[model samples]
Target: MPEEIPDVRKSVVVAASVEHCFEVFTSRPADWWPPSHVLVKKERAGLAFEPFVGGRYYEWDIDGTEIVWGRILEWDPPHRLAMTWRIDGHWQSVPDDDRASEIEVDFVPNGSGGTRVELAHVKLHRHGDGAWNIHKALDGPSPGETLARFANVI
Candidate 1:
C-alpha cells in the first residue's frame, strides 16, 4: 500500500458572517486563488464553483478552454464543503477521480461576527506513488497564503 501524504491544513479568521464568507469562497473563488495555480494555456480568466453536491468547480481561459479542478462532494452551505482533488500526484490535471485525493473547507463562526475558515487537503494516499512530493510542495506554516488571500478578499 502507498503511504499517505500528511494533510495540508490552513485557516484564517475573516471579519464576515459565516454565510458571507462561504458565499465568496465558493461563488467568487478566483479573487483569492493564486496566479501560479493557473492551468489554462492562454491568459487566465474567471473561475467558480457549481454551488451544489455533484457540481464542478472549474476555471476557464481567455481562449475559452476550461479545466475541471474538482467536483463538489459535500456542499453544506455556510458551514462545510468538500470536493475531490482532481490533480494527479505529479501536480497535473486528471480527467477523473480514479486516484484523486480530497479537500475540505469549514466555515465556523468565531463568536464575534467573524468566521474561522479552514482548508484541509486530506486522503492524499489515494494519489499513490507521488504523494510525498505533493506533500512536500504543500507543507508549510499554518494559515497558509492561499487561505490568507481568501481572508483578505473578505
Candidate 2:
C-alpha cells in the first residue's frame, strides 16, 4: 500500500546575507552536520560537497575511505539547492538514487539583512518499504530537530 510521504519541512534564520548563508551551508556541511550521521567505520576525516548538479556530497574516513551520501540535483547558488537522499529507510546506504528520497533547501532574504533557510526532506516514500518510519523520526512542526542542529551552528 503506497501512501503519500509528507515532507519534513524545517527552517531557520541565519545572521548573514542569503548569499553568504548559502555559501556556508554548501562549503561547510561537515561543520554543522552531526558527526553521528556518518557511515564511515574509522576516524572521520571530513565532508565535502561539490557545488554543482550531479556532483556528490561525500565523507571520508581517516583511512582514506570515501563514501558518498548523495548526488546534487539542483545547484542554484544563494537561493536553492537540492539533492538525492541516498540513505534508505533502514538508515543504511544505497548504491545510488534508485532507493533514495530527495532533499531540497532554499535560501531567502528576510528583509532584515538575514537569510531564511528552509530544508525539506521530500518524497520520502522512495526510500522503500519502511519509509514511513523515517517520516515518524522526522515529522514535526517548524524548525525541526535537523534545522535546530543547523541553526545552532549558524
Candidate 3:
C-alpha cells in the first residue's frame, strides 16, 4: 500500500554486479548520469555523494564555484543509502517551508551477475502546498518508468 502512495519510484535491473552498479550510480554520478540533468546551471554542478553515514550529498560548480544542494540520511555501502534530495526546483524546497523530500536506494545482488536497484523518492506530500498533486502525477503510470530511462545507460 505504501508503494501505491503518489511519489517517485524508479527501479532498474543492471546487467552488472551490485558493487559495480552501486559505484556507478553514486560515486560516478556524472559519468553515467545525464550531464544536462543536474540541479544548478547544469554544466557547472559537479555531483558528489560521500557514500557514508552523515556524509553530505552535494554538488559543486567546478570545484566550489557554487556548491549547492543535498542532505544524506543513511549511507550503507553496497546495500542501501538514504538521503534528502531537495534541490532548488519545483519538487523540493526549504524544510521550514515544509518542503523536503527523501531519496532511498537499495542495491540487491542478482545471481546472474546483475543487480536489482530500487530508487524511491518519498515524502513528497510533506513538501506542502500542492505537493500532493506532484505525488499523484508520479504514480500516474508505471512506477519504474524513471528507472527504465536509466536502464538504457546503466
Candidate 4:
C-alpha cells in the first residue's frame, strides 16, 4: 500500500475572540505570515485568504500575476472554515510522483470568545521531485510559525 500521513492535526487557542481570530486568519494572513515562507519575492508578494466557499487562497505579484496556492473547502463564517492545500500537487502531482499532500484548517468557537483552530496536513508522499519543498514547509519558517505569532498578536 502507498504511504499516507493520516494526520497533521494541530490545535491552538488564541486569546482573541473566535470571530476576531477567524478574521485574522482568513482576511490578514500576510500580516502574520513569515517573510521567509513566501513563495514570491518582493515586499508586495501578498497573499489573499478569501473567506467564501470556492474562494482563492493565493499569492499575487505586484504585476497581475497570481499563483493560486490553495482552495477553500468550507466557509462557515466566524465559526469554521476549511481549506484544501495542494502544494507540490498544485499542478504537478502525478501517479508516478511520490511527493504530495493535502492540508485542511478548521476553526471552532471555544468558550469565552476563544477560537480553537485545527490544522491537518495529511497524505504526504515525501519522496517525489517536489518532496524536498514540502520538507521545507514542514520545518523551515512556515505558516505554522505565523499561526503561532497570530495567537499572540496584540
Candidate 5:
C-alpha cells in the first residue's frame, strides 16, 4: 500500500438554516472571504462560485481580471458542494487537472436550528514534494481560520 495522505478537515456551526448557510457560503462568498487570501496581483475585488456542476470557481482583481481557482465537481444546494482545488504551494493556480486536489463542503442541519458546515481538503500528496507543507498551511490561516471567519459571518 502507498503512504496515506492526510486531509484538512474543519467543521463549524453557523447560526442559520441549512439553506441560508449554503446560500451565504456559496452565493455570497465575497462577504466572508478574507482579502489577504488571494492569488491576484492587484487587490481582490470579489470571490464567487458558479453554483453548478462543471462551473468555474474564480476571483476578481481590482483591475478586473478573473483568476480561476478551480472547477466544480459536485454542486448540491443546501447540502453539499465538491470542487477541484488547484492552487499550488506558491499560491499560484495550477492549470493541470491531474495535479489538483479536492475540497468538499457539506451543510447539514445541526438539529437545534443551525447548520453544520463541514469542509474537507483531500489528496494533498498529489501536489508532490510540497504536500506536507501545504497541509500544514491549511492548519493556520487558510482553511482553519478561514472557516472560522466564515462561521462568524453566517
Candidate 6:
C-alpha cells in the first residue's frame, strides 16, 4: 500500500471581527501578502482576490501584466472561501486545471468578537514533482508569517 500524504492546514486568530477579517483578506490581499511569496516578486504591483464564485485570484505587475494564480471555487462571505491553487509542478504560474491543487479558508467568530481563520491547502500530489516542496513550504512558518502580517493590518 502507498503511504498517505497529509494536507497543509494552518489556523490563526485575528483581532478583528469575522466580517472585517474576511473583507480584508479577500478585498485587500496585497496588503498582507509577503513579497517573497509572490511569483513575480520584483515586478509585482499588487494582488487581488475577486470575491465571487468563478472569480479570479491573481497578482498584477507594475506594467499591468496580470498573472493568474487561481480561480475562486467557492466564495461565501465572512465565512468560507475556496480556490484552485494552480501553480504548476515547476513552481511557476501555469494554470492547468488537471494538475491544480486546492486552498480553502474559513473565518469563524471567536467569542471575543475576534475571528479565527483557518487555511487548508490540499490535493498537493496533483502537482507531481513539486508536491513535497509545496507541502513543506506551506506546512512551515510561512502561513503563520502571512497570518501575522494580516493581523498587523487589521
| Candidate 4 deviant stretches above 4 angstroms | 1-6, 35-40, 62-64, 88-102, 126-154
- All candidates: TM-score: 0.68, 0.69, 0.64, 0.62, 0.70, 0.69
State candidate 1's TM-score.
Answer: 0.68
Q: List model 4 lDDT by residue over 71-121, tens digit each.
A: 555666665566655444333333322343445666677777666777666
- Give lDDT tens digits, candidate 6, residues 1-154: 1124556755788788887875665565656454344333344458776666657677776775676655667777667766666554444566456666667777889989888888766666766756455433333232443355456555
lDDT of 3 at 74: 76
- Residue 49 lDDT in candidate 5: 69
* lDDT per model vs. reference: 0.61, 0.61, 0.56, 0.53, 0.61, 0.61
Worst 10 residues of 1 by lDDT: 134-143
Give the winner by TM-score: 2 or 5.
5
Q: State the number of backbone clashes in model 4.
A: 0
* TM-score of model number 6: 0.69
**Each prediction's Cα RMSD?**
5.0, 5.1, 5.7, 5.8, 5.0, 5.0
lDDT (C-alpha) at residue 147 in model 6: 56
Question: Distance from true position, residue 5, model 6, in Å?
Answer: 8.8
C-alpha RMSD in Å of predicted model 2 compared with the true structure: 5.1
Candidate achieving the largest TM-score? 5
How much is the lDDT of residue 43 in candidate 5? 51
> Which of 1 and 4 is ahead in lDDT?
1
lDDT string for model 2 (1-154, tens) is: 1135546865777677777776765575556454343333453448776767666667765676566655677777667767665544554455667766667788788878777878877556666646555444333333244556566666
Off by over 4 Å in 1: 1-5, 8-10, 34-43, 88-93, 128-146
Provide the clashing-pair count of each candidate structure: 0, 0, 0, 0, 0, 0
Score candidate 5 by lDDT: 0.61
lDDT per residue for candidate 3 within 83-102, as digits (tens), equals 66444434334343336667
